[PDB]
Structure formats: C-alpha cells, structure tokens
C-alpha cells in the first residue's frame with residue numbers, strides 16, 4: 001500500500017527506513033540509495049535491473065525512485081536525465097503535488113533542487129556514492145562500476161577512436177563540440193607503427209573505441225589483427241595507476257571474425273560478447289557483437305538471436321552487391337550512460 | 348631483365364656497382380649488400396630478412412643467396428656449405444658464359460667458399476661476418492626506447508626466484524636455472540603435450556606445479572599464483588618455419604599462441620610505482636616474416652636480439668630473443684664444458700663428417716662403419732647441451748622423442764641469457 | 776554445500792586446496808590437515 005505510509009510514518013511515528021517507499025511493503029531488504037527510506041527485495045532487484053536504463057532520445061527509461069516507466073515526469077534541467085512518476089510524487093510528497101508539478105513545466109527535480117519544501121520524501125546526502133556502494137553490495141557478480149559525477153564536476157570527454165571515426169555519433173550525442181577547432185576526439189586509421197610513447201604524447205583519454213570493418217574490405221589485413229591492435233593501444237591508453245577518474249573502453253564487431261577468433265577475443269577482453277541486433281517487423285535486419293565496460297552494456301544483450309542465424313546473416317550480406325555502411329544506430333545508444341559521467345552540451 | 352641491363356651498363360664503367368641494388372636492380376639504394384658488392388633497397392632487405400636463413404629439406408638454402416629469389420639455383424659442393432646461387436645472378440656477376448661452364452665443373456665451390464675470393468664483376472667484401480652481426484643492429488626501422496635498467500638488490504636481501512614459464516616444453520628454463528644454482532621458490536609451467544609434461548615431471552622431480560592449456564589461464568590465476576619474478580616463453584616454430592612441408596598458413600595456430608604469451612605477460616607485470624625487479628624473455632625463430640617480426644616487436648615494445656648457438660654449441664640455432672634481462676646484447680662466451688665441434692658430441696665408435704648440424708644428399712650426418720646414420724637421440728641432447736640421457740623418461744618412439752628434442756631452446760644460449768639473474772636472486 | 780562450491784573453485788585452479796579447510800570449508804585456516812592436503816580451522820581441530 002503506497003498510500004498507507006503517510007499514516008504509518010505520521011500517526012505511528014515510524015521511521016521511513018522501516019517501510020518500503022517504492023511500493024508500501026513493511027519488510028525491507030535494505031535502504032533506498034537516492035532517497036531516505038528502506039527498500040524491499042523485489043524492488044531491490046527491479047532497481048538494479050533498471051539502474052542505468054535510458055531511452056533512445058536521451059532520458060532515463062524508468063522512474064528514478066521506484067523504476068516505473070508507466071508514467072513519467074521529465075525534469076526541466078538540461079543537465080538532468082532523471083524522470084519520475086505521479087504515484088510517487090503524490091504518495092511521498094503529499095496528496096496534490098504531481099499535478100502541480102505537471103502544470104509547472106519548468107520543474108527541477110528533487111536531486112536538482114532540494115530547496116522546495118518536501119512532505120515526507122527526504123533526499124539522501126552524498127547519494128551518488130551511496131548508489132555506487134548499493135550496487136557493489138547488492139548486485140550479484142558486481143562489475144567495473146564508477147561513482148557518478150556531480151554535474152559541475154563534469155569535464156569534456158577525451159576519446160580515442162580506432163579504425164572508425166565516432167566524432168559524428170558523439171557530437172550528435174552532444175558529447176563532442178561542433179564549435180571547436182581543437183578536436184576532442186583523435187581518430188586513427190593506421191596504428192601499425194604506434195608506440196606507447198605516441199599514445200601518451202596524444203594526451204590522456206577518457207574513452208577508447210575500436211571496431212572491425214564491415215564486409216566491404218578497405219584492406220586485406222585479417223580481422224583478428226584489428227582486435228589485437230585494439231588490445232595493445234587500449235593497454236597504452238589506460239590511466240596511470242592511482243587514478244580515480246572514470247576510464248572506459250568499447251570494442252565493436254560487425255560479424256566479421258569467425259567463432260575461433262571470436263573465442264580468442266572473448267578471452268582477451270575478459271567477458272562474453274554482447275549481441276545487439278536490428279529487428280524490424282520481427283525480422284533480423286542486422287546485428288553487432290560488442291565488448292565494453294560501459295554501464296548496462298550487458299542488459300542490452302539479446303539471447304534470442306542464435307549463432308546460426310548470425311552465420312546466415314553474414315552469408316547473405318557478403319553476397320550482396322551493396323556498399324557497406326557503418327551501423328551507427330546500433331552502438332549509438334550504447335554511449336548514453338556516459339551522460340551521467342561526462343560533460344554534455346547541445347545547442 | 349632490368350637488373351641485367353643495369354649490370355651491362357656497370358661493366359662499361361658508366362655506373363658504379365655500389366650505386367645499384369644487385370638483388371633486384373632497384374635505384375632506391377639505401378643500404379649496402381652485407382656479403383657482396385652493391386647497394387641494397389629496403390624491399391630487398393625485407394626479402395633478405397625473411398629468406399636468407401630458410402633451408403630446404405635438402406639441408407641447402409631454399410632460395411638464392413644474392414637476391415633471395417631467382418628461378419633455378421646452383422648448390423655448392425663444398426663440405427658444410429649450404430649456399431645456393433641462382434643462374435640469373437651468376438649471368439651478371441661472373442659472366443653470361445661462365446655459369447654454363449661452371450655447371451660442367453663437377454667439383455664446384457660457391458663464391459663465398461671460392462679459394463681465390465676475388466672475381467671480375469663480383470668481389471667478396473672482407474668483414475662479412477662482422478657486417479652480418481651488424482646487419483641485425485641495422486634493424487633500426489623499429490626504433491624503441493631501451494629496456495629499463497633496475498638497480499641491483501643487495502646479496503643479503505635476495506630471495507628465491509619465481510618463474511611463470513609458458514610453452515615450457517621439456518623444462519629447459521628451470522633446468523638452466525638449476526644449473527646456475529639459483530634458488531627457485533616456484534615454477535609454474537603451462538604445457539599441453541603429455542610427453543614434454545612427463546620429461547619435466549621426472550627430470551625436475553615433481554617441483555613444477557603443472558597447469559593445463561595457456562588459453563585457459565586467466566588473470567585471476569596469475570594473481571592467485573603469487574607474484575612472478577621471471578616470465579619466459581617461446582612460440583611454436585613447427586609451422587612458422589619453412590622446414591615443414593605443410594605450410595597452409597603462417598600465423599594461424601602459432602600466432603594466436605604468441606598473443607597468449609603477450610596477455611599473460613601483462614597479467615604478470617607489476618604496476619607502475621611497484622619497482623620490484625621483474626623480467627621476461629620471449630623466444631622465436633629467425634626464418635619468419637618481416638611484418639610478423641614488426642608486430643611482435645611492437646606488441647612486446649622491444650627490439651629483438653638475434654642469438655646464434657654456433658658461438659657456444661654444436662648446432663646452428665639462430666633465434667630471436669625479446670626481453671629486458673640485463674646484458675641480453677653482450678657477446679656470447681663458450682665455456683670449456685660446451686662442445687664447439689660435433690665430433691665431441693658423438694658417441695664412441697662414431698666419426699662425424701660435419702662440424703655443425705642441421706636437423707629438421709646429406710640428410711643423415713654421421714659416417715659410422717662406412718654407412719650413413721642419424722645422430723642418436725642422446726647425442727642430439729649432447730648437441731644442444733642437455734644433460735646426458737635427458738629425455739629417456741617414458742616409453743616413447745624415437746621419431747617422437749627426436750621431435751621433442753628439436754623444438755627445445757639451446758641450453759648454453761639460455762645459460763648465457765639467464766646468467767645475470769644470479770645478481771638479483773638467491774643462490775644455493 | 777558452501778564447501779562444495781569452494782572445492783569447485785579449487786579445481787578450476789583459482790584457489791589453493793591448502794588455503795581452505797577441507798573438513799568444513801571454513802576460510803579461517805590456522806592449521807594444516809595432518810593426514811591429507813588442505814588447511815584446518817580450530818573448531819575442526821576440536
């Protein structure tokens with residue numbers, strides 16, 4: 001009972017930490033990370049699932065407190081993706097607040113501004129850290145996971161992109177500047193002569209990207225060679241040990257290296273490939289295999305797409321007379337969580 | 348053909364022979380040819396790096412010595428010489444009528460073995476072994492920084508060495524460490540072939556903690572098996588060499604396994620700021636591709652050192668060594684225990700015609716009792732400097748056991764490399 | 776159960792058998808087991 005808590009806390013003088021704010025359950029597995037209160041075990045699982053899930057346009061997919069995508073309130077800060085739901089705002093903040101908020105249309109959310117008086121819902125201090133610690137202790141098999149950066153503490157992102165220029169993509173994601181002459185991305189075609197001294201001369205980097213080519217071969221050098229060159233220059237672009245700043249890396253395959261070379265690649269990048277298809281009408285138009293550390297890269301995986309169907313796709317697309325196009329839209333949305341880590345701007 | 352026109356122009360004293368690449372007739376002269384007189388373009392340098400130490404099943408060279416190509420080659424009749432001179436180069440440097448008349452000469456010596464030494468258009472440059480040694484220091488196309496030199500730890504503070512040996516084989520690395528008297532805390536060795544496992548188990552008395560395949564080993568394994576002080580390894584050269592008749596690829600199979608060594612090297616390397624002494628040795632064979640060699644040098648971030656075992660042992664075992672072991676460059680010294688003649692490595696009752704051996708016409712090197720015979724397996728152990736009867740552990744065939752011995756590192760070479768590690772780790 | 780998961784992790788060569796108590800799977804390894812290979816916690820000693 002979401003509505004009952006307003007009696008339970010006020011009349012029964014009961015701590016918010018003893019009840020689940022996300023649904024109204026009285027048995028809590030732990031406390032809620034972002035806001036003051038407990039949280040029960042299915043809601044904990046639901047939260048961890050939805051955690052870094054965003055939408056295609058840019059904003060967070062589910063309701064930041066309870067992870068309800070059914071109803072959504074968009075915050076009016078260009079540097080805040082946090083979207084809410086009505087049931088929470090009236091349940092936790094008093095009986096007629098979500099409609100007023102909806103009628104404002106210039107409403108900063110709780111995490112944006114706390115200055116506004118709140119009925120019951122209190123914002124936890126330091127909550128970025130609390131979120132990280134929550135994921136650490138509460139996720140089964142936790143992963144490479146970095147604390148979310150406060151918005152004023154968000155610097156522009158330094159990208160190395162090997163064998164494929166991502167300037168166009170990430171600029172369209174507002175991550176890179178259209179008005180700058182000093183480029184904030186360093187595209188390299190040929191890495192063959194490159195030394196560790198050279199990658200260090202080019203500056204430190206925040207994001208490293210590298211991808212195998214599509215089926216129309218620009219060169220005959222085998223698809224394993226790109227993977228291994230990526231691994232090397234990746235080990236070069238790693239930040240000096242002791243660095244708290246967030247370093248990421250993302251390798252992409254356009255179905256061009258076989259299962260044997262794929263097994264080798266899975267070993268060397270120390271996780272299993274994430275397949276991200278293009279399905280139109282139910283039909284598999286295209287697909288791409290990824291390795292990266294980027295948050296919620298692994299929950300985009302589609303275990304429905306079998307390996308035999310990908311072999312059939314590779315055979316059908318090799319035998320066509322069409323020139324090969326980079327599948328921009330498949331890996332485009334796989335950079336959205338870096339919004340919460342790095343400086344955005346879009347005119 | 349353009350080659351031949353250019354040499355025609357040279358014999359008129361209109362062009363210097365040193366201003367023309369004698370291998371392929373290119374005008375892009377950057378280098379001088381190391382053995383003979385003439386220039387040397389860079390494509391012919393890459394072809395010379397790949398092809399010079401390639402030998403057929405015959406035991407003689409796969410291609411011509413001059414141009415590393417050619418059409419039909421002329422094999423040398425001198426003893427222990429394996430060089431070949433193709434007909435097209437002898438049409439130039441000796442004359443268009445002297446190749447045909449030199450074929451008719453039944454005791455025919457080649458021009459590196461010619462007792463006279465000087466000829467009309469071709470003359471042999473004098474310090475050619477010195478220039479052959481300098482030719483691999485001439486490989487500065489891959490320019491890198493020198494390996495970081497760590498200051499020596501005092502003798503009272505030294506500890507037993509810990510070795511991660513990938514592609515162990517018959518445990519040559521641990522054996523050479525025990526020959527030097529270095530205390531070995533532990534010796535982790537990944538290996539797949541059962542026979543080599545068994546050789547190491549018996550000869551090193553269960554000390555080696557054996558593992559499975561190199562590919563299965565994760566970074567978690569590397570961390571949990573203690574900090575490693577010395578990581579050693581060598582890629583398979585069965586498929587990588589031109590000696591195997593079945594060369595379907597070049598860096599299928601073997602290439603993958605090099606990257607397994609690369610990965611576990613980065614897993615076993617201490618962090619920046621951790622200044623503890625750490626060392627690593629990779630080994631490969633010289634008859635390899637240039638772009639292959641480049642990719643290896645670039646991944647391992649170092650200039651290779653070629654080391655031929657002829658300087659110390661009774662075989663022609665020229666191998667590349669990448670690494671950071673101190674004094675990897677310094678010249679090889681052969682102790683009195685090492686046998687520089689083949690005849691000393693033979694059994695009693697046997698007399699060798701050769702002084703050095705080529706193990707993969709004269710395919711079988713030994714004249715015993717007026718009969719041609721293979722080296723015995725225990726002699727092949729003696730040729731590489733192994734202890735006597737080193738591989739007679741299990742009931743294995745002679746062909747398999749010879750094949751098990753022929754892949755192995757040369758023991759006095761690896762002693763020469765591992766010797767300055769005594770300065771860093773404890774002794775027995 | 777937990778000790779069976781532990782031994783599973785040992786046969787993958789991610790953990791030594793001498794760093795675990797083979798009797799009950801305790802991580803509090805003070806002693807070595809006298810007869811066989813493995814550690815030994817104090818409760819298992821008693």
Ligand SMILES: Nc1ncnc2c1ncn2[C@@H]1O[C@H](CSCC[C@H](N)C(=O)O)[C@@H](O)[C@H]1O
Pocket residue numbers: 513514515516517518519537538539540543560561562581582583584604754755756
């Ligand atoms: N995947 C693999 N893992 C471990 N060893 C392998 C392997 N594939 C091949 N090998 C073995 O590694 C060796 C290649 S070279 C071995 C030379 C070794 N230094 C010695 O002195 O014996 C061969 O014995 C080969 O059988």
Ligand SMILES: [Zn+2]
Pocket residue numbers: 020021022023024025039040041042043
């Ligand atoms: Zn709940």
Ligand SMILES: [Zn+2]
Pocket residue numbers: 063064065066067068084085086087088
């Ligand atoms: Zn909600």
Ligand SMILES: [Zn+2]
Pocket residue numbers: 075076077080081082108109110111112
């Ligand atoms: Zn907001």
Ligand SMILES: [Zn+2]
Pocket residue numbers: 368369370371372373387388389390391
């Ligand atoms: Zn040339």
Ligand SMILES: [Zn+2]
Pocket residue numbers: 411412413414415416417432433435436
């Ligand atoms: Zn020739």
Ligand SMILES: [Zn+2]
Pocket residue numbers: 423424425428429430456457458459460461
């Ligand atoms: Zn000769």
Ligand SMILES: [Zn+2]
Pocket residue numbers: 796797798799800801815816817818819
């Ligand atoms: Zn116990």
